[PDB]
Design a protein around this nucleic acid. Sequence first.
RNA 1: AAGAGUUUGAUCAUGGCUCAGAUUGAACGCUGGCGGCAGGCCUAACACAUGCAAGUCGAACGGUAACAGGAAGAAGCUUGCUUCUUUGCUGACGAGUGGCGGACGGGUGAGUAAUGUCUGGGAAACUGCCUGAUGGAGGGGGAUAACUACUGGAAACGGUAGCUAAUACCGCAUAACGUCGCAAGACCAAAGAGGGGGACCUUCGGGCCUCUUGCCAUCGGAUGUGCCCAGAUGGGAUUAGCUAGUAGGUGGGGUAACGGCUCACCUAGGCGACGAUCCCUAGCUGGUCUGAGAGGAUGACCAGCCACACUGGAACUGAGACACGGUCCAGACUCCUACGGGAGGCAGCAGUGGGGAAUAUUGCACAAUGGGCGCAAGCCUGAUGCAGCCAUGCCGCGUGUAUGAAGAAGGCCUUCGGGUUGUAAAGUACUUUCAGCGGGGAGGAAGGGAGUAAAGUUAAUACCUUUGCUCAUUGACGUUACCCGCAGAAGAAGCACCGGCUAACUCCGUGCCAGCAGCCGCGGUAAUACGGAGGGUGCAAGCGUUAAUCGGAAUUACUGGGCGUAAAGCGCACGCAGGCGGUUUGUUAAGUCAGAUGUGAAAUCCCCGGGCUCAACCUGGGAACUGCAUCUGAUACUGGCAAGCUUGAGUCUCGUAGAGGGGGGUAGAAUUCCAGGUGUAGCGGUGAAAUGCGUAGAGAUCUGGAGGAAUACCGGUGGCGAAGGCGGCCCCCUGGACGAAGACUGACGCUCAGGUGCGAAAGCGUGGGGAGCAAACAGGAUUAGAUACCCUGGUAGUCCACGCCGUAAACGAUGUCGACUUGGAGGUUGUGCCCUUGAGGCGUGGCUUCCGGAGCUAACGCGUUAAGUCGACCGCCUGGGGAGUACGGCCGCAAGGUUAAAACUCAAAUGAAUUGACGGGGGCCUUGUACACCAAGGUAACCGUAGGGGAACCUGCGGUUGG
Lengths: 123, 95, 129, 82, 80, 100, 88, 50, 205, 85
Amino acid sequence: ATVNQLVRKPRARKVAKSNVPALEACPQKRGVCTRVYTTTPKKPNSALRKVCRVRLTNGFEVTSYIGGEGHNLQEHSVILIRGGRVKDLPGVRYHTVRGALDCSGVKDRKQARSKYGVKRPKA
Amino acid sequence: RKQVSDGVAHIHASFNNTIVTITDRQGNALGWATAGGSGFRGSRKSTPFAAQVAAERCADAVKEYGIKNLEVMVKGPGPGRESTIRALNAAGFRI
Amino acid sequence: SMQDPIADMLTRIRNGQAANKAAVTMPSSKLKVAIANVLKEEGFIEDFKVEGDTKPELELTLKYFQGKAVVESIQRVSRPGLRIYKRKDELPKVMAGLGIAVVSTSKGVMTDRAARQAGLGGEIICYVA
Amino acid sequence: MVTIRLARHGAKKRPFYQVVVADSRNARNGRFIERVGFFNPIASEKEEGTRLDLDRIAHWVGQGATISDRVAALIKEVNKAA
Amino acid sequence: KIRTLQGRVVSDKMEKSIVVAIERFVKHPIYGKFIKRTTKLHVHDENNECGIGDVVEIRECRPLSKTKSWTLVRVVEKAV
Amino acid sequence: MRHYEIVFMVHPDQSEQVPGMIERYTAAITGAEGKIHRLEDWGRRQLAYPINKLHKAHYVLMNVEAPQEVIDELETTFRFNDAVIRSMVMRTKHAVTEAS
Amino acid sequence: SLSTEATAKIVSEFGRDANDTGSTEVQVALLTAQINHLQGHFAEHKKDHHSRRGLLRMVSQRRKLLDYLKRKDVARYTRLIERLGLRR
Amino acid sequence: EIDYKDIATLKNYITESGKIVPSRITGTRAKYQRQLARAIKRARYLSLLP
Amino acid sequence: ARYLGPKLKLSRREGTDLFLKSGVRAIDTKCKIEQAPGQHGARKPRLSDYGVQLREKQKVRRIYGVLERQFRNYYKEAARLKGNTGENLLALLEGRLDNVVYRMGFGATRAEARQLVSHKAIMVNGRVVNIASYQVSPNDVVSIREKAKKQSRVKAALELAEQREKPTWLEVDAGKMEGTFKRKPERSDLSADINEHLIVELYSK
Amino acid sequence: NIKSAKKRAIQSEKARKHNASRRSMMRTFIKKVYAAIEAGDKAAAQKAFNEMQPIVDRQAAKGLIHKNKAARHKANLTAQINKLA
RNA sequence: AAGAGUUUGAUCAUGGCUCAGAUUGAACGCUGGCGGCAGGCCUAACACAUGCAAGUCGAACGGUAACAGGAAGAAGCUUGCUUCUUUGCUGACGAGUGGCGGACGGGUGAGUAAUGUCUGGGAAACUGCCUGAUGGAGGGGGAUAACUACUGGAAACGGUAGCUAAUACCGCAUAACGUCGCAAGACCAAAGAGGGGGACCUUCGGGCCUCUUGCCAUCGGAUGUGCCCAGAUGGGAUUAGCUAGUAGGUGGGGUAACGGCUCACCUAGGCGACGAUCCCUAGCUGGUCUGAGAGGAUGACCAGCCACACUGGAACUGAGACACGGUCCAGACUCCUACGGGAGGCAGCAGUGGGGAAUAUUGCACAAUGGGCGCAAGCCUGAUGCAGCCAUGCCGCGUGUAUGAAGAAGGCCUUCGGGUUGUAAAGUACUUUCAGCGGGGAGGAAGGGAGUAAAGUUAAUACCUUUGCUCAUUGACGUUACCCGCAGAAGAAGCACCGGCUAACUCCGUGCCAGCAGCCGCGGUAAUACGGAGGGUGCAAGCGUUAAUCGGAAUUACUGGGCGUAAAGCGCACGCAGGCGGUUUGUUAAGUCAGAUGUGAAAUCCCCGGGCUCAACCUGGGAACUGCAUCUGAUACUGGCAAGCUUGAGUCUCGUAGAGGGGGGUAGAAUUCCAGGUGUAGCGGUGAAAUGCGUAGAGAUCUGGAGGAAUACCGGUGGCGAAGGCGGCCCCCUGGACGAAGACUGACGCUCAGGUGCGAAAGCGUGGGGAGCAAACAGGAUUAGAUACCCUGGUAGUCCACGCCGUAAACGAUGUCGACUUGGAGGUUGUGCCCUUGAGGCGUGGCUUCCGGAGCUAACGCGUUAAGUCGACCGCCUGGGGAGUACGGCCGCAAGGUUAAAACUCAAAUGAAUUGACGGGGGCCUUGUACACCAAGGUAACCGUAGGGGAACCUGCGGUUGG
């Protein structure tokens, strides 16, 4: 940290690490959803959790959390995925967009009803 | 063998077993005796009883030689150094 | 001392102050004289005096307020390694002007308000407070 | 060729013109040598609609500088206003 | 006498030309240290009157060759 | 050229040749440009440990001043002579002449 | 190691006057002589390493003195390095 | 002052077998002690003492 | 966007009264009060330092019928204006045309006044201005359009205007209905308990 | 393809043939001077210069070559001649 | 101007992670009224259907295909009503020639890491149109397209023959103020057209007069472009050498111009650690975002510059191009074909396919402002003005107002009384913004046209120019803004959230499931955390979620960081360049500083105004642009230069100690065997035997030989050495250290990347050597099995000579050097004074040990031998793992070493200390890792290296307290 030391090789900036690295600065990415399975969370929790395996248009194959109290996906359906990790076994760093491409809003939902792609009941 | 009533008792006081020779002033052995094999063997050796009984064995091995004064030239430290010296000298010998 | 004889003097001052030495001493040089003059004429220290010719020394006399040093923090700024020069309109106001910054201007070593009055900048020798 | 033309600034349907000394060949409101006044076609009555600063226009005209017709008519109007 | 940089001869080994290091003492933009920065600069002298170490005045002129646009004015100190 | 203290034991077996071996080395020293500052003998003393199968030794110490080199041949001869099994010499670090 | 008489004599020849054992030329002269003696006695050991450290010290100090001579006064240096024979 | 040849004032500083008594009980200024050990080892090699 | 909901409840949360059901029946007679407007209003209201900054600021927003984008815009203006941010903000809130129409009397509540302003019944300096947030400036004459002077509500909103203490910084005329914003008001004659530095702390981070 | 581009293309080629003819004739005269010089013949070279000069000087006048160019030929050839003198 | 949560029983730390803020060219979910103003392919410089984006000029020209007039004729014969023919006769004009334009405007950001950009300078240049000055503007010719007649080719595109004009071309004349030349001299140009017409001539065409405009030359201006220089403008040293028109020279040539630009010759340079070359990324700037600021990130829109136009070459023409909608040729594509041959290039506008999370109309008008051409009228203009689409952003406004309770039904909660939703509704009265309908209605329009005097000018009147006034006229937007009227509250509210942070909570349901989650975490019978309800909170035409940037984060620390134990001080030295430099003078003026001047586009930002009903927006003026340059001045400081001074550093002299290093032999302690006797039943060992020895004489004894390991005691908190490390004695050689002073030099210093050298033990390689060892290896038994442990032998190695290794817990886990700063005790050595006893007493040096004050510290601790206070330089660190590993380089006999990633992966890892629990080391007191909320324990924790072995384990030689 001598000034003559700094002049010879300046202070470098470390680089922001990989947090959602499968998305190249894109809000969402489309994917093809190869397999749909149901994993199991870490230790303190329970209640085996629905997760899908998806191949993104940019080449990546990643693991994405189908959330909501209801689910209809399949083995090739095309879905949109966005950032957001689950405190699950390592590597669920993406969240499937509920109700956007081949994906539907949860059934009978009536609160937080845009966070699952379900439309306003006409009342 | 010589009936000179003099000599030295080289106490080969090793840790496990002592083989004390009885040699005169000239430097020739009179009689030899040992602790181990002469009545007991085991790891329970290296005890003052073993050194003592070795001392009596070495004494009686040369009590027939007319020797009643044996100096002690101990080689190395051995268990029951006090015990072996006492048992050897109490047989009627002079250091 | 060896390469910066001026931080020598600041360090001797704050050493002898924190250890409650009556009067600090060092060898003398006309720029050391200059900062001593500045300090005592504006009064952060009491008095100084130089003795001998071949190896002069500087018998500077510290200044205690109650038992505390009058000089709270005295800092080197333009060390060999970063010579610091300021222009007059960017001269540094030290602790809301309460402490001086003895600058070296083209018109001799002199203090901060001195320069901003005379309207010229220069090299900052040492903040005092 | 150097010309004294107008550069349309302002917002939409509320034009404001800068009178500008420029090379004939640059975009209407692109690179320009000098600004000599402004024109507000939709100015209010108390509001100043034209300012020209005609010494510079005379200067540049003396160096061989064409005027657009709008700046020409505008200059005639300011001269009439006196 | 336009601006006449002032520097040292570091090689007269080409015919009628010298390399002249102009040594300038500029602060560091971010660390504020004053660093030595050097400008090597081919100069023309037709008389080959400069030798390694001289201190010369040089002035800018039209391009005399590739790489060569400065010309010798005076030899202010004839280093030996 | 500085003081040494030639110290050596002459055995009774080798006491046959005390003057010959001694005066020979004094002459060799003087011819090697060395002057003798002292001379004394401690007689035939006794050896605590019977080194070299003997108990007596006529300890003669000659203690001449010698330069760096003229000692090398003398100690070589001492090693090569059975008159003294082991001969010792000492540097001075000072100016000491008297024997005791 | 070097004889004191030799130091005094080199002071006489390679000193401007007497008792100027501090003169730069005197310093480099005695130091170079010590380096020469070390080089002469080097063939015998070579195995020795802790003695070599002082010899490198002597070499470097001699060169520093010579560099100071060259910097301060070219003529003194460019005469000494021959009448002493150094800087070969 | 203390040297090797003074055999008289050496018996006080040794034992029968020639074992150096430590200065922890005598007091020898720790410079005379090195000279003491030097001289007595010399005497061992001088074969006056074991 | 204008808040269009129950008016009494909006002021039950703020604790004090806000002059937004304004008239005769003297609320706490017109509708229960001193109670937070829920099924769980009886709860202890102990609320953090953030809760009270938010409550006071929110009550200032509810006094004037201003939403959060314009409110923070008023704050950015007061913070850029010269003087303490608190009074600059509250003066901005006070020179707003809906407020001043209310204050001059004609306009029974601030939403009554907002209704009149928006419905092209107010001239500012003799020309019609129907913007609610129109900042009225000193010496401007605010007047009812004469096509709308014979409004039953404006005539009624004028009797119940002296029970409200007459504002000092402006001189309404009642017979001919017209006023004159004499001067920007001062913290003292903004007759309330507005703890404005709670607001200037909410937005100071 | 635009109509004026089609016309520029036919006009360019006509002008190119015209220009090529004029430049080749000029280079012929200049080369005659240069080749009288290398023969070392002073008077032949001066006459060839007097035959080249109006040619390059009118080519420059009608814009086939720049006036600076014509001046350069005249200066260089005058040098060569006056050296050869 | 420097939040919250997040490693523990708890804590103080070190340290990463996650959310809070602002922002966006955003996207997606749910929802969606109006207006204003902006923005709108960030990805595929991917491929491109179709239309449009560059023409104009008849006042240059031959013309005359058209249309329209004529003027006729011939007719029909209406009195000539309309039909044919003729006539470029006239308006005009299609194709052609000619001029100007097409080099602008418009797009894009591929390439480009620096001659590109930015800042500031320069000199060797050219510049159409515009402008000022001066002059000229004579007299001829030959073509040729068109056209005419043929005539190929499918088409593209042609060929032949004749014909012809010009402001096309070409002579000739003329000819400086131009070029060339020292001068003398030589040389060098051009074009007409239009309007009007008195008089006069007239070959009746015109001449001729006059005006207008053009043409040519030169010299200025202005503008634009070219060229040069300096500084600044990414990353990588797992790129260190690169260059041969390369560097300079002299001459030819070339260029508008300088110049290796080029060529011939000559010379051998030139660039590079101040980073050349090479590789990667990349358009630059004004500015934008963010920030307290420094700074970081950016470079969409707007404006400046650059580059590109399918890809790669080349030029032509031109004032300008190496040319987006030009040429050529070479590709690759697509299209056309009669298979001969052709065509084309949306990085114009729109649009398509594609790709993408994702980004609009194949609109209207040239009314305005620009631009091109034209005398003008005009024509052209996807520039531009507008309109469309899209909550994409910003702004504004609305979706009502007041009243009213029987505080309704009814919903939800009900401790069953009721409460709450809630003045909310309804019912009352009132309003009618905006939306809708009808009527009106600015402003963006200046102009241009037609008519009206100056003797403007001059054949005076004409023509034209200018002002002269009058008349008519020009708006895409646009059924504009805005105003007026008319109904009717009528047409207009959603999204998130409600355990704490964090504003806002109850009931059912569910039951560690379903699920939620930024963090803490919630859920196994309530669960205010999950789903629904009711209630509330927040924001509102939006509200959420995602992504990305900056901040928080001072978490790359210049401002503004650390390296004893948390990551981090090289194993140790010497030292090159480099960074830094005691003191006093002289001088310089480099840095520095001051002043002046020039500059720093505009926009943007900021201040003060003004205009839009307001606001956004637009705008005027200022400030700002903190920079760069130049000039003048100062001299304190740093630098240079010159001279000194002695305190720094050194030389000398004299002494002092020491396992300091190298040499050689050096004797004994002990060492086994042999040499023999003396002696016969044992030598031998573990958990236990056993394996192995011996009775063939074993063990021990003395006698003598060997050889080598180490020189026990000394010995030490000792000493020495730069570190590793150093222990017999003697001598030789030698280093370093210190004390005493003196004499002298005279800043000759400190630190150092790269570099060089030294460097435990193991090892390796080379040969010896082997008294014993002792990894390996070989006998017994193991133990749950034994390749445990273990007892028996035993090689390599250990030893020596040489060489290679290059390592360590190489540890004070504390870089070097200098300076200052309360103490105490101890040892270690010198040396002065005075007891002139030897110490003594009082010092004074250096070294070292243990406390301890302030001070510092996370705490422990350090504490004049700093971990305090400072200065100089270096090395090093940035959460954990991956991993000191791969790869590359380099080194080595290999063994390996050295430099040193990345992918991937976690939300932690880690240090200090504390409460006490096991405490099988002691007399209510002693304690530990770990632990809790197992450092005395089937056999310390490691590091280096080498073996055995599936392995982690064990075992050798060395070392550490991290016991």
